[PDB]
Amino acid sequence: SGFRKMAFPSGKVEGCMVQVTCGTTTLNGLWLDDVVYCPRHVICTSEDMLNPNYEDLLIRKSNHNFLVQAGNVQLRVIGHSMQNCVLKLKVDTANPKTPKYKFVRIQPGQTFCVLACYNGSPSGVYQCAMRPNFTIKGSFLNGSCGSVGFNIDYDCVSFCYMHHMELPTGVHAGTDLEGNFYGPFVDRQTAQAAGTDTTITVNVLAWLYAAVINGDRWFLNRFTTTLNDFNLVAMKYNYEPLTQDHVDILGPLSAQTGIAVLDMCASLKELLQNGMNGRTILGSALLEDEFTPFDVVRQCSGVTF
Amino acid sequence: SGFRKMAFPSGKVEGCMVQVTCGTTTLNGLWLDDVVYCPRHVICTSEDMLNPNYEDLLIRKSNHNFLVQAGNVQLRVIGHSMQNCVLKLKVDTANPKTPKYKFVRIQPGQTFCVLACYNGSPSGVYQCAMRPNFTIKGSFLNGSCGSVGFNIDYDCVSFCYMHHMELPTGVHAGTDLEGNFYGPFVDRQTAQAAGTDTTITVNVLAWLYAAVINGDRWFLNRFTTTLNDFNLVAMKYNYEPLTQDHVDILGPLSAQTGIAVLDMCASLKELLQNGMNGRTILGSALLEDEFTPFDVVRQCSGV
Numbered sequence: 001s002g003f004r005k006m007a008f009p010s011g012k013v014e015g016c017m018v019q020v021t022c023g024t025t026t027l028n029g030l031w032l033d034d035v036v037y038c039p040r041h042v043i044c045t046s047e048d049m050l051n052p053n054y055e056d057l058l059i060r061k062s063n064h065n066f067l068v069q070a071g072n073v074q075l076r077v078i079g080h081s082m083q084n085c086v087l088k089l090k091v092d093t094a095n096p097k098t099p100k101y102k103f104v105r106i107q108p109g110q111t112f113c114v115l116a117c118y119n120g121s122p123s124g125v126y127q128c129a130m131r132p133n134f135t136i137k138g139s140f141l142n143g144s145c146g147s148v149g150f151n152i153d154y155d156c157v158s159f160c161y162m163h164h165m166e167l168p169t170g171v172h173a174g175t176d177l178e179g180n181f182y183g184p185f186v187d188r189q190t191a192q193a194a195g196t197d198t199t200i201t202v203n204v205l206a207w208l209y210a211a212v213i214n215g216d217r218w219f220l221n222r223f224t225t226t227l228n229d230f231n232l233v234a235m236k237y238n239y240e241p242l243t244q245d246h247v248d249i250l251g252p253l254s255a256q257t258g259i260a261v262l263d264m265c266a267s268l269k270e271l272l273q274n275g276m277n278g279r280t281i282l283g284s285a286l287l288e289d290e291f292t293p294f295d296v297v298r299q300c301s302g303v304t305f
Numbered sequence: 306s307g308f309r310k311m312a313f314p315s316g317k318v319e320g321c322m323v324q325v326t327c328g329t330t331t332l333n334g335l336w337l338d339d340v341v342y343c344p345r346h347v348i349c350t351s352e353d354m355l356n357p358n359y360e361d362l363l364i365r366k367s368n369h370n371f372l373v374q375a376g377n378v379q380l381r382v383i384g385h386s387m388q389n390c391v392l393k394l395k396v397d398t399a400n401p402k403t404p405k406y407k408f409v410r411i412q413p414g415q416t417f418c419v420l421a422c423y424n425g426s427p428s429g430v431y432q433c434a435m436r437p438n439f440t441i442k443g444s445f446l447n448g449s450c451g452s453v454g455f456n457i458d459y460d461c462v463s464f465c466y467m468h469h470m471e472l473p474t475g476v477h478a479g480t481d482l483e484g485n486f487y488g489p490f491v492d493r494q495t496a497q498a499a500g501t502d503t504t505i506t507v508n509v510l511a512w513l514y515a516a517v518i519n520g521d522r523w524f525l526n527r528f529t530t531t532l533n534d535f536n537l538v539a540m541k542y543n544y545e546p547l548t549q550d551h552v553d554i555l556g557p558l559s560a561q562t563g564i565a566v567l568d569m570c571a572s573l574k575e576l577l578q579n580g581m582n583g584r585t586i587l588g589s590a591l592l593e594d595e596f597t598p599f600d601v602v603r604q605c606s607g608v
């Protein structure tokens with residue numbers, strides 16, 4: 001038993017982190033087979049970052065301008081290209097530690113593990129959630145750009161995030177492994193503000209199911225509700241609306257506990273309208289929204305990879 | 306900026322996780338060099354676990370009784386010894402993925418990272434703290450015995466915990482890599498209780514410093530307190546006393562924020578007596594104590 005913020009093992013992603021340096025600008029890159037993926041602003045200097053033209057700056061660069069380093073071993077760049085805000089560099093060596101992988105664009109609320117890297121050297125690992133406003137409440141310092149977020153399924157590593165920005169409010173923003181930003185942010189040295197955040201309803205419900213599984217079920221009521229009526233009420237409390245995919249992934253926890261998705265919704269809808277009246281769930285009076293139904297299943301069922 | 310429960314990368318440890326099987330009992334083992342470490346209750350049957358005479362049960366075992374599997378390969382046990390509750394299995398092959406490692410006994414309040422494994426396969430990683438009562442609030446299911454906790458310094462892995470037991474309260478207990486249990490627990494199949502837990506004060510103060518570094522300052526105040534007067538209130542609320550060493554370890558965080566330790570203590574004392582109202586610190590409604598000054602300094606340096 002026990003419920004904690006659990007991250008996937010990072011062994012597979014560690015062997016793919018490399019250091020990409022252009023001039024004096026250095027960040028982390030992802031070495032998959034014979035291609036290294038990294039943020040494109042590495043070709044930028046301190047001043048160009050203010051207002052850059054990446055297409056203009058890239059034409060002035062050649063393969064020999066890029067320094068790719070695995071440890072202290074250089075990987076000669078034999079080709080370069082730009083896809084959105086991500087830069088792709090072909091190297092002369094196929095990563096012998098390349099795992100079965102895939103590129104995926106996660107959804108708001110979905111969780112992933114972040115491998116904090118600095119100078120191509122992994123330093124820490126932690127789990128985080130893609131907030132409804134397309135930001136992540138992570139932990140990043142200078143030199144963390146290029147750090148990737150991932151999910152481990154079976155033996156495939158599904159890369160879904162590459163770090164780029166830290167907003168003024170302390171949150172962070174990035175793109176997928178195809179250079180496409182999450183949210184309306186841009187890779188420029190500018191103070192950008194994200195939209196108002198909301199509570200991830202699907203995750204709060206998965207937390208409730210985690211409680212019901214652990215004998216804590218006082219919050220269950222004899223009420224039910226429609227998916228539409230619940231979503232309209234949930235928005236009045238800063239709770240993200242539920243989707244078809246949300247109801248589906250809540251199935252396993254629904255069958256295991258025997259409580260229908262729409263029954264738990266009415267139970268959560270009551271917790272929002274009347275409060276908690278003291279008391280707590282899983283020992284905490286604060287509703288947690290950064291545990292997906294999978295995180296509840298994986299951690300309560302010991303799923304390995 | 307930002308603060309998050311961060312664990313060390315588990316790559317160097319994943320290459321050492323194997324599966325040990327004896328009869329109908331299976332658990333995880335740690336393969337370092339030509340040796341494999343695992344809990345000794347793997348040699349026990351469902352009946353022996355109730356009251357195991359491990360010395361007796363061990364001598365009645367042979368090398369071929371232990372099935373050590375490393376992925377799709379089986380390791381040949383050419384020897385077996387016992388060091389307290391840890392069973393040392395010698396094999397014919399040396400683990401090439403064996404990193405530079407050391408065996409250390411963690412202290413209460415210190416933190417380490419746990420690599421949860423089931424059947425010799427890593428399932429997840431998280432950071433946890435050795436509670437003052439020598440338990441840990443981890444996440445372990447059946448087949449988790451053999452999982453190890455560790456800290457990494459440069460490229461040297463410091464092993465300090467091997468999982469064994471889940472108390473009836475839902476907490477977890479285990480031993481260091483020398484087989485010595487943390488706390489007054491024994492590896493028998495009995496319901497065991499731990500001593501009354503206390504809060505790691507120095508970790509709470511460090512976590513408050515992390516909150517201030519990240520823009521949270523509502524709990525601060527103008528008052529200041531003496532070390533003794535703070536400890537009097539801390540002990541009253543079941544908080545570990547703050548030592549002059551603890552004050553020194555907090556120095557770097559006090560300089561970065563400009564808030565003196567005894568000034569932070571005044572805030573904590575007020576939080577203990579008045580509560581947190583409906584407010585939160587770093588997204589939490591409870592005073593966190595599973596972050597050491599080092600863990601805070603690592604994430605908040607330069608911010």
Ligand SMILES: *[C@@](O)(CO)[C@H](C[C@@H]1CCNC1=O)NC(=O)[C@@H](CC(C)C)NC(=O)c1cc2c(OC)cccc2[nH]1
Pocket residue numbers: 026027041049140141142143144145164165166167168172186187188189190191192306
């Ligand atoms: C990468 O290391 C760049 O390689 C960092 C990541 C941040 C450093 C501290 N913590 C981080 O998460 N990214 C940057 O330094 C750039 C990214 C651009 C060039 C794509 N800048 C910012 O993140 C940035 C810029 C501003 C700003 O404009 C001056 C105002 C407020 C915040 C801010 N953040």
Ligand SMILES: *[C@@](O)(CO)[C@H](C[C@@H]1CCNC1=O)NC(=O)[C@H](CC(C)C)NC(=O)c1cc2c(OC)cccc2[nH]1
Pocket residue numbers: 001331332346354445446447448449450468469470471472473477491492493494495496497
């Ligand atoms: C190992 O996986 C066994 O190989 C297992 C892991 C824990 C149980 C589920 N979660 C865990 O973290 N450990 C045990 O089952 C140990 C075995 C001992 C060391 C031989 N025992 C317990 O966890 C245990 C026994 C009892 C008990 O008695 C009977 C009464 C109440 C709780 C309890 N836990």
